[PDB]
């Protein structure tokens, strides 16, 4: 069973893919989650400098102008955390940061600028990642950003199946290489972060993150080369959406959005407008799922679902 992974940067492909190993496999040893120790801080401090840089360009100040000298300190420390150190005072500095109402307001803001979605988790779990001999867990290690760039290939075995995984970058630079992998593919898993929708491109701040993922599905589904391929559609980061939704109206990406401001019905329509592109609607189909790529026992079902599918 060959399966590819596609879609836009940052849609969860990566993340499904460390799923299998925790799902199929006996998950990350002690080793490979401490290989993740770099990242997860590197993860963090780039989020709390993305916040500090917005509110330069926002003009937001600090709830407390002490603040000014943490955001000093920041700087002159965060090399080491890059290094995968953490010191009790660059956790102390970030803390303080974190907790202000100026970089609170802006964090509130981030659609306005470009932060990585793991933001808020890392910093509210400060006090336990700074710990002295921290190993990351396994939500740790799923929660972690890194751009893939490459091929990556990941094998496993499931109901006497074995699966060859192929996974590839979505940030425009990347999809040139997609076409390497479009050989013998069983199915094809397109992802798509349902809380794109009030996001821009980090490519490009003009083009929303939302109509993007739909010209490449269009792209994707409709492809000759892919008619006996199944196609299976995972609208992700479920849970993000569902916080968002209610804050930030959807007529933003879909102005004809005629529904309310609730998950179910908010989410029935992004199904609808994905399922239209298909143009061979009576001869192909499109296996729907709705998904917290992060979540294991989420993906574990859908998974299943899946595979018989397959
Ligand atoms: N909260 C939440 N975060 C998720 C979910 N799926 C993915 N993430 C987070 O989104 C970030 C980006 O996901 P990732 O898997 O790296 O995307 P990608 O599609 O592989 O992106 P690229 O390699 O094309 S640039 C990661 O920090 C990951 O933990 C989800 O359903 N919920
Ligand atoms: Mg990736």
């Not at 069973?1 to 990566?14: C, R, Y």
Request: glycine letters at 4%; charged letters at 25%; a negative charge.
């Amino acid at each position: 069973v060959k399966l590819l992974l596609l879609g836009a940067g940052e849609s969860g492909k990566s993340t499904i893919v460390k799923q299998m190993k925790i799902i199929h496999e006996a998950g990350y040893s002690e080793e490979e989650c401490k290989q993740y120790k770099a990242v997860v801080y590197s993860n963090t401090i780039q989020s709390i400098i993305a916040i500090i840089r917005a509110m330069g360009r926002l003009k937001i100040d600090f709830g407390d102008a002490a603040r000014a000298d943490d955001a000093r300190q920041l700087f002159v420390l965060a090399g080491a955390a890059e290094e995968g150190f953490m010191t009790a005072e660059l956790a102390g500095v970030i803390k303080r940061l974190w907790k202000d109402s100026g970089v609170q307001a802006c964090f509130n803001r981030s659609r306005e600028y470009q932060l990585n979605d793991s933001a808020a988790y890392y910093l509210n779990d400060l006090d336990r990642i700074a710990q002295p001999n921290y190993i990351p867990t396994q939500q740790d290690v799923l929660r972690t950003r890194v751009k893939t760039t490459g091929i990556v290939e990941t094998h496993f075995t499931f109901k006497d199946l074995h699966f060859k995984m192929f996974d590839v970058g979505g940030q425009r630079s990347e999809r040139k290489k997609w076409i390497h992998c479009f050989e013998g593919v069983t199915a094809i898993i397109f992802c798509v972060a349902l809380s794109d929708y009030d996001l821009v491109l980090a490519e490009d701040e003009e083009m929303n993150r939302m109509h993007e993922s739909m010209k490449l599905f269009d792209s994707i589904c409709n492809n000759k080369w892919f008619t006996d391929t199944s196609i299976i559609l995972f609208l992700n980061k479920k849970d993000l959406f569902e916080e968002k939704i209610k804050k930030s109206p959807l007529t933003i990406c879909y102005p004809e959005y005629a529904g309310s401001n609730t998950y179910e019905e908010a989410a029935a329509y992004i199904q609808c407008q994905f399922e239209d592109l298909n143009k061979r609607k009576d001869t192909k189909e499109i296996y729907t799922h709705f998904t917290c790529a992060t979540d294991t026992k989420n993906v574990q079902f859908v998974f299943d679902a899946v595979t018989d599918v397959i």
